[PDB]
Amino acid sequence: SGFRKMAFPSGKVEGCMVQVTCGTTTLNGLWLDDVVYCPRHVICTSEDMLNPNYEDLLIRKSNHNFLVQAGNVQLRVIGHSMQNCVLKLKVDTANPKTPKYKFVRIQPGQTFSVLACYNGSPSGVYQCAMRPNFTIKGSFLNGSCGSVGFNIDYDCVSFCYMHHMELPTGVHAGTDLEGNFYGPFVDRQTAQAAGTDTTITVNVLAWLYAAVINGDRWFLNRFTTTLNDFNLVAMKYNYEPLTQDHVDILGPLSAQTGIAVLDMCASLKELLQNGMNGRTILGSALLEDEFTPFDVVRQCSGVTF
Amino acid sequence: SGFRKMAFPSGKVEGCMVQVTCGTTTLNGLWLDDVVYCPRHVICTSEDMLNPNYEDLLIRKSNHNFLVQAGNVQLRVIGHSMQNCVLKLKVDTANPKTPKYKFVRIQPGQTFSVLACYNGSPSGVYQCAMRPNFTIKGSFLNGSCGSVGFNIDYDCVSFCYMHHMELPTGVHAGTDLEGNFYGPFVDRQTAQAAGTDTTITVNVLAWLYAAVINGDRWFLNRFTTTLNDFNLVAMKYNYEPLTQDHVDILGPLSAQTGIAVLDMCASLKELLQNGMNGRTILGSALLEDEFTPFDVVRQCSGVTFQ
Ligand SMILES: CCNC(=O)[C@H]1CCN(C(=O)c2cncc(Cl)c2)CCN1Cc1ccc(Br)cc1CC
Ligand SMILES: CCNC(=O)[C@H]1CCN(C(=O)c2cncc(Cl)c2)CCN1Cc1ccc(Br)cc1CC
Ligand SMILES: [Cl-]
């Protein structure tokens, strides 16, 4: 038993991280097959960053302006091009450690593991969710750009995030691996702000089920509610709407625990209205919203990769 | 910016995990060079587990009674020995993925990454602390024995924990990689219970420093305390004593933030008395005690957001 914020094992991704240097800038790249992916802002000076014309900046660069190192081994760049906000550096060697992989664009509420890297060297791993406002609450310092987020299924790595910048409130923004930003952000040093965030309701419900599975039951009650009535409550507390699809996805946990989703919604309503009265749930005094239903089932059933 | 429970990248350890089978029992082992390390309880059946005589159980085994599988490949066992509560199986292949490594026994309050594994395959990675009562609060199911805990400061893997069992209260117990249990526990299914746990004071202070580094000062106050008066108060909330060693090791964080250690102690006293009044610190409504001073320096900026 026990329930922890758990990341995927990162080894398959570690073997893909490289150092990319362009002029005075060093950041991280992802080496898959014979391409290295990194943020296109790698080509910008501080002045350029204020209002970049990426096409024009890139025309002045040769392949030899991009220095790529995989550990202690230099990779030779043989082509360069952009896709959206990602730079693709074609190299002369396919990564022998390329895992089975896909590029996947995730939706708000979905979780993933982040491999924080500096100077092409993996430094740490942690779990994140894509927030409703399309930021992530990561942990990143100067030099972390090009760090990636991913999930694993069996042997297949699904890459979903590449890190581009930190916003003024200290949360993080980035792209999918095709260079499309999550959220209304641009790769320019200009005033930008996260929208007001909301809580991921389906994930809070999943975590309440995790708590029950782990023996924490004090918040259960005799009551139930309807989807419509509960959604009035969610709106009041800045929670995301709960959909029928969310209810459906939680069906296994409902069956396992004997607590219907709308019964657990009655528990959640009471927590929102009354607080925890000095108690905790799975060691938290807050309602945790960065475990998905799948995360709960995975961790409670010992799935491996 | 940000502050997360941050594990070490697990790849160097993933390449060392194997499955060990003896009779009907299968669990995880750690393959380093030409040795596989695993809990000695692998040689017990359910009928043996209450009062095992490990010497007597082991003498009845041959090398070929141990099956070791590394992915799809069977390794051949060519020797075995018991060291404390760990079994060491000598195999006829050195692991080509052996990282630079060492074995370290840690003290209560120290943190490490756990790679939870089943059938020699990794499931996930998370951070744990060695609690004052010599347990860890992990996430482990049936089949997780022989999963390990480690740090990877500076490219070398320091292995510090091997998982042996879950105790009745749902917390976890295990050994160092020399097979010595943390705490008073034994590898027998007899009644044993962890002592009452306490909060790791030095770690809470480190985390308050992290909060200041990351730009928040709301919980500070104008007061100070002596070390002795701090300890007299904090013990009333089931906090561990703060020693002069702890004060010394908080020195770098104190210097970076301009907040004397005993002034941060006065802040903590007031938080214990008042609670948060609806605020949070680094995304938590409780005082977090599973980040060490070293962990904070590892993860936070060297420049305070003033
Ligand atoms: C030389 C020109 N490049 C830059 O200026 C880089 C420098 C590196 N950075 C980091 O390494 C870092 C990452 N995570 C967290 C922290 Cl604290 C720092 C920050 C990102 N900026 C670009 C930038 C900055 C603000 C905004 Br708004 C948008 C953009 C464009 C997407
Ligand atoms: C067949 C004989 N071996 C056993 O019974 C094994 C079964 C495997 N186990 C697990 O895989 C597991 C690990 N973590 C968490 C969970 Cl929930 C289970 C639990 C450990 N026990 C031994 C045991 C059990 C209680 C105590 Br007290 C001491 C000891 C001796 C160290
Ligand atoms: Cl009702």
What gap in Å lies between CA B283 and CA A170, rounded to an integer?
Answer: 12
Q: Is A146 on the interface with B (CB under 8 A)?
A: no
Nearest C-alpha neighbor of B121 from the set B245, B222, B25, B27: B27
What gap in Å lies between CA A299 and CA A302, rounded to an integer?
Answer: 5
What gap in Å lies between CA B73 and CA A61, rounded to an integer?
Answer: 48
The closest ligand to the CA of A27 turns out to be 1
What gap in Å lies between CA A71 and CA A96, rounded to an integer?
Answer: 13
What gap in Å lies between CA A292 and CA A279, rounded to an integer?
Answer: 23
Nearest C-alpha neighbor of A250 from the set A233, A228, A227: A227
Residues in Cβ contact with B5 at an 8 Å cutoff, skipping those fewer than 6 apart: A5, A126, B126, B127, B290, B291
What gap in Å lies between CA B74 and CA A260, rounded to an integer?
Answer: 46
CB A42 within 8 A of CB A36: no
Stretch (H or E) spanning B41: none
Sign of CA pseudo-dihedral A269, A272, A278, A284: positive
Ligand 2 atom closest to the CA of B167, numbered from 1: 27
Q: What's the burial of B24, exposed, middle or buried (CB within 10 Å: 0-12/13-18/19+)?
A: exposed
Name the method of structure determination.
Answer: X-ray
Q: Which residues pair with B113 in a beta bridge?
A: B127, B150
Please answer yes or no on whether A125 and B170 come within 8 Å at the CB atom.
no
- H helices present in chain B, as ranges: 11-14, 54-59, 201-213, 227-234, 244-249, 251-257, 261-274, 293-299
Identity of the residue in B14, B170, B214 whose CB atom sits nearest the CB atom of A9:
B14
SS3 category, B240: coil
Q: Is A58 on the interface with B (CB under 8 A)?
A: no
CA A289 to chain centroid, in Å, comes to 13
Q: Which residues line ligand 1 (CB under 6 A)?
A: A 25, 41, 44, 46, 49, 140-145, 164-166, 187-189, 192; B 1
Based on the residue annotation, tell me whether B64 is a catalytic residue of this protein. no
CB B141 within 8 A of CB A6: no
Chain B residues with beta carbon closer than 8 angstroms to that of A215: 170
What gap in Å lies between CA B76 and CA B67, rounded to an integer?
Answer: 7
Backbone φ and ψ of A32, nearest 5°: -130, 130
Residues in Cβ contact with A250 at an 8 Å cutoff, skipping those fewer than 6 apart: A202, A205, A206, A209, A261, A264, A293
Q: For residue A262, report the distance from its CA to the centre of ligand 3, in Å.
A: 10
Q: Which residues line ligand 2 (CB under 6 A)?
A: A 1; B 25, 41, 44-46, 49, 140-145, 164-167, 187, 189, 192
- Structural domains in chain B? 1-14+100-197 (2.40.10.10), 15-99 (2.40.10.10), 198-301 (1.10.1840.10)
Distance from CA of A56 to the nearest CA of B (A): 32
What gap in Å lies between CA B289 and CA B237, rounded to an integer?
Answer: 14
B121: nearest CA in chain A? A304
Per DSSP, the residues of B75-136 read EPEEEEEEETTEEEEEESS--TTPPSEEE-PPPTT-EEEEEEEETTEEEEEEEEE--TTS-B
End-to-end CA distance of chain B: 13
DSSP letter assigned to residue B141: -
Residues in Cβ contact with B54 at an 8 Å cutoff, skipping those fewer than 6 apart: B40, B43, B82
Q: Which residues pair with B111 in a beta bridge?
A: B129
CB B113 within 8 A of CB B11: no
How many separate helices (H) and strands (E) can be counted in chain B?
8, 13
Chain length of chain B: 306
Q: What's the burial of A175, exposed, middle or buried (CB within 10 Å: 0-12/13-18/19+)?
A: buried
Based on the residue annotation, tell me whether A246 is a catalytic residue of this protein. no
CA B71 to chain centroid, in Å, comes to 26
Q: Hey, which residues 24-43 in chain A have their CB within 8 Å of chain B?
A: none
Nearest C-alpha neighbor of A3 from the set A216, A240, A251, A181: A216
Sign of CA pseudo-dihedral B31, A123, B201, A271: negative
End-to-end CA distance of chain A: 20
- Tell me, letter by letter, the H, E, C secondary structure of chain A: CCCCCCECCCHHHHCCEEEEEECCEEEEEEEECCEEEEEHHHHCCHHHHCCCCHHHHHHCCCHHHEEEEECCEEECEEEEEEECCEEEEEECCCCCCCCEEEECCCCCCCEEEEEEEECCEEEEEEEEECCCCCCECCCCCCCCCCCEEEEEECCEEEEEEEEEEECCCCCEEEECCCCCECCCCCCCCCCCCCCCCCECHHHHHHHHHHHHHCCCCCCCCCCCCCHHHHHHHHHHCCECCCCHHHHHHCHHHHHHHCCCHHHHHHHHHHHHHHCCCCCCECCECCCCCCCCHHHHHHHHHCCCC
A124: nearest CA in chain B? B8
Task: For tokens 């660069």, name the residue.
Answer: A61
What gap in Å lies between CA A55 and CA A205, rounded to an integer?
Answer: 46
Ligand 2 pocket: which of B45, B49, B87, B171 to mutate (most atoms within 8 A of CB): B49
Q: For residue A263, report the distance from its CA to the centre of ligand 3, in Å.
A: 8
Please answer yes or no on whether A139 and B3 come within 8 Å at the CB atom.
yes
Amino acid at A191: A
Please answer yes or no on whether B115 and A3 come within 8 Å at the CB atom.
no
Distance from CA of A170 to the nearest CA of B (A): 5
What gap in Å lies between CA A65 and CA A281, rounded to an integer?
Answer: 53
What gap in Å lies between CA A243 and CA A109, rounded to an integer?
Answer: 13
What gap in Å lies between CA B85 and CA B176, rounded to an integer?
Answer: 9
What gap in Å lies between CA A251 and CA A296, rounded to an integer?
Answer: 13
Stretch (H or E) spanning B196: none
Identity of the residue in B7, B140, B280 whose CB atom sits nearest the CB atom of A124:
B7
What gap in Å lies between CA A51 and CA A42, rounded to an integer?
Answer: 14
Distance from CA of B141 to the nearest CA of A (A): 6
What gap in Å lies between CA B248 and CA B138, rounded to an integer?
Answer: 30
Q: Is A166 on the interface with B (CB under 8 A)?
A: yes
Report the C-alpha dihedral over residues B273, B278, B282, B286, rounded to 10 degrees. 50
What gap in Å lies between CA B232 and CA A260, rounded to an integer?
Answer: 48
What gap in Å lies between CA B202 and CA B196, rounded to an integer?
Answer: 18
What gap in Å lies between CA B305 and CA B211, rounded to an integer?
Answer: 10
Nearest C-alpha neighbor of B289 from the set B107, B105, B111: B111
Q: Hey, which residues 185-244 in chain B have their CB within 8 Å of chain A?
A: 214-215
Chain length of chain A: 305
CB B175 within 8 A of CB B37: no
Residues in Cβ contact with A228 at an 8 Å cutoff, skipping those fewer than 6 apart: none
CA distances from A214 to A282, A285, A294, B89 (A): 8, 16, 16, 35
Amino acid at B305: F
